[PDB]
Design a protein around this ligand. Structure first.
Ligand code: HEM
Ligand SMILES: Oc1cccc(F)c1O
Ligand SMILES: Oc1cccc(F)c1O
Length: 291
C-alpha cells in the first residue's frame, strides 16, 4: 500500500508557519493544564501515538491517514489521556480547516518540541485523510511493563534501531505518567515542560527502587520523587542501550540532533514523498519571531 504526500492545494511554508504559530500561542496561553505542565508533552505523545501504529511490513497505520480522528483509534486504551491533546487542537483545526488531520497532529508534536526549547524538527506536509476503514486496530502501541528485548523487537516494526529507540525515549523527560490513564504515576524529572537530556542523566544518577504503585503495577521510583517505567529502566539494564544512554547523558547537542532525526523519521514513516515535493520546512519559534 502506497501513500503519496499531496500538498494541501496552493499552500506553502508561510501557511504552515501560521498554523505552527497558532499552536504555539495556544500552548503559551493554556498554561494551567495538568498542574502547570501545559499541553506540550501531551501533544508530543499524541504525535508519537498517531505515528507509532505503523507497520513496515504492509504500510498499515502511520501518521498519513489521520485516523486518530476515528472512534476505534481515539478509544484505544493505549491512547487514554490523548483526548486532551485532540481537544487542544480542535480550535486550530477550526481556524485552519485546510490542513489534513495527520499534518495537524504531527505538526502539533513538532511545535511542542520546539516551543519547549527542543531541537528544530524539519517537517513535511502532505499527509491526506483516509477513511474510517483504514484505521488500524488497537494493540499496536507498546506495553510499559516489559524488558529491553521487548522494546528492541517492538521498535523493529517501526524500522527503528537501538540508537533511534534510545533517542526517542528521551521524550520521557517531558510530562508525567497519570495513574488513571496508564496505571503508572509520576514525572521523570524536575524540568518536565522543557526539552532537555534529563531523562538520561536521571537514569544514570538517581537511586532507583523497584516499587508498586497504587494500581498494583511495578515502577522504578527515586527519593527525588521521579519515576521510570520498566521499559525506561530497561535502557540501563541492556549493555547496548546503556552505552547510548551514557552518550546522550554526556552530550546534549548529540541527543538533540539524533532525536530530531528519529522523530522526523517516526512522523514520516509510511509516506512516499514525490521527487518534486517541497523540501522539509523548519519553522521559527515564537521567540525567534519576536512573538
Ligand atoms: C517503549 C516505548 C514507550 C512506552 C511503553 C511508553 C509509555 C508511556 C506511558 C505509559 C506514558 C504515561 C501516559 C499517561 O499516563 O498519561 C507515557 C507518557 C509519554 N510518552 Fe511514552 N512510551 C514509550 C515511548 C515514547 C516515545 C517514542 C515518545 C515520543 C518520542 C513518547 C512520549 C511520551 C510523552 C511526551 C509522555 C508524557 C505525556 C503527558 O505528560 O501527558 N513515549 N509513555
Ligand atoms: O477534528 C479534529 C480536531 C482536532 C484535530 C484534528 F486533526 C481534527 O481532525
Ligand atoms: O518514565 C516516564 C515516562 C513518561 C513520563 C514520565 F514523566 C516518566 O517519568
Amino acid at each position: 500500500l502506497v501513500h503519496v504526500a499531496s500538498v494541501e492545494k496552493g499552500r506553502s511554508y508561510e501557511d504552515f508557519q501560521k498554523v505552527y504559530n497558532a499552536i504555539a500561542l495556544k500552548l503559551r496561553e493554556d498554561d494551567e493544564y495538568d498542574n502547570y505542565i501545559g499541553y506540550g508533552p501531551v501533544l508530543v505523545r499524541l504525535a508519537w501515538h498517531i505515528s507509532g501504529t505503523w507497520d513496515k511490513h504492509d504500510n498499515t497505520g502511520g501518521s498519513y491517514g489521520g485516523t486518530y480522528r476515528f472512534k476505534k483509534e481515539f478509544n484505544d486504551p493505549s491512547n487514554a489521556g490523548l483526548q486532551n491533546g485532540f481537544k487542544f487542537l480542535e480550535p486550530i483545526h477550526k481556524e485552519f480547516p485546510w490542513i489534513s488531520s495527520g499534518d495537524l497532529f504531527s505538526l502539533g508534536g513538532v511545535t511542542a518540541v520546539q516551543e519547549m526549547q527542543g531541537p528544530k524538527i524539519p517537517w513535511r506536509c502532505g499527509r491526506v485523510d483516509t477513511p474510517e476503514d483504514t484505521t488500524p486496530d488497537n494493540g499496536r502501541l507498546p506495553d510499559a511493563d516489559k524488558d529491553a528485548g521487548y522494546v528492541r523487537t517492538f521498535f523493529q516494526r517501526l524500522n527503528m534501531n537501538d540508537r533511534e529507540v534510545v533517542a526517542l525515549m528521551g521524550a520521557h523527560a517531558l510530562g508525567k505518567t497519570h495513574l488513571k490513564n496508564s496505571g503508572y504515576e509520576g514525572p521523570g524529572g524536575a524540568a518536565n515542560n522543557v526539552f532537555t537530556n534529563e531523562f538520561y542523566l536521571n537514569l544514570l544518577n538517581e537511586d532507583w527502587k523497584l516499587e508498586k504503585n497504587d494500581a498494583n503495577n511495578e515502577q522504578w521510583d527515586s527519593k527525588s520523587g521521579y519515576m521510570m517505567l520498566p521499559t525506561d529502566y530497561s535502557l540501563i539494564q541492556d549493555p547496548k542501550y546503556l552505552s547510548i544512554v551514557k552518550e546522550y547523558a554526556n552530550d546534549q547537542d548529540k541527543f538533540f540532533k539524533d532525536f530530531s532525526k528519529a522523530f522526523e523519521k517516526l512522523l514520516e514513516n509510511g509516506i512516499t514523498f514525490p521527487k518534486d515535493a517541497p523540501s522539509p520546512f523548519i519553522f521559527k519559534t515564537l521567540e525567534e519571531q519576536g512573538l
